Amino acid sequence: MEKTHVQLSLPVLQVRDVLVRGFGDSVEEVLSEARQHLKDGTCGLVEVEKGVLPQLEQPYVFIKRSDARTAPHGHVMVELVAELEGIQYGRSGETLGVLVPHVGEIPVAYRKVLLRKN
């Protein structure tokens, strides 16, 4: 059975290397596909800086900090929040980055997270 939270180490990708720049065409689809790729180990993370989001496809899936009181074992506790046309679906803390499919790109780092399964 799946636990409420899972430890994952996500590959951090540079935006210009990403081949598949989003998970789908609707808020519900991108959240669904992101969660599936997270379970399969085929999800990467792009850190948000100026210029990044316009190079990626909407809707966006962000991982955001869900608890600022403790980060177990160095894994920041995080949850998913989607965004389309300036409207967010969920409310959470600070953005760690935007999730994208990982299809073999070489990462620049790994980001340890404790992901809320839902």
Residues 44 and 102 sit within 8 Å (Cβ to Cβ) = yes
Per CB under 6 A, does 56 bind ligand A1H0N? no
Shortest distance in whole angstroms from residue 51 CB to ligand A1H0N: 23
Q: Is residue 6 a contact point for ligand A1H0N (CB under 6 A)?
A: no
Give the helix/strand (H/E) hosting 35.
Answer: helix 27-40
Closer Cβ to ligand A1H0N, 68 or 103, answer by number: 103
Give the residue with the Cβ less far from ligand A1H0N, 103 or 108. Answer: 103
Residue count, binding to ligand A1H0N (CB under 6 A):
3
Complete DSSP assignment for 56-110: SPSSEEEEEES-SS--GGG-EEEEEEEEETTEEES--S-EEEEEEE-SSPPPSEE
Binding site for ligand A1H0N (CB under 6 A): 20, 101, 103
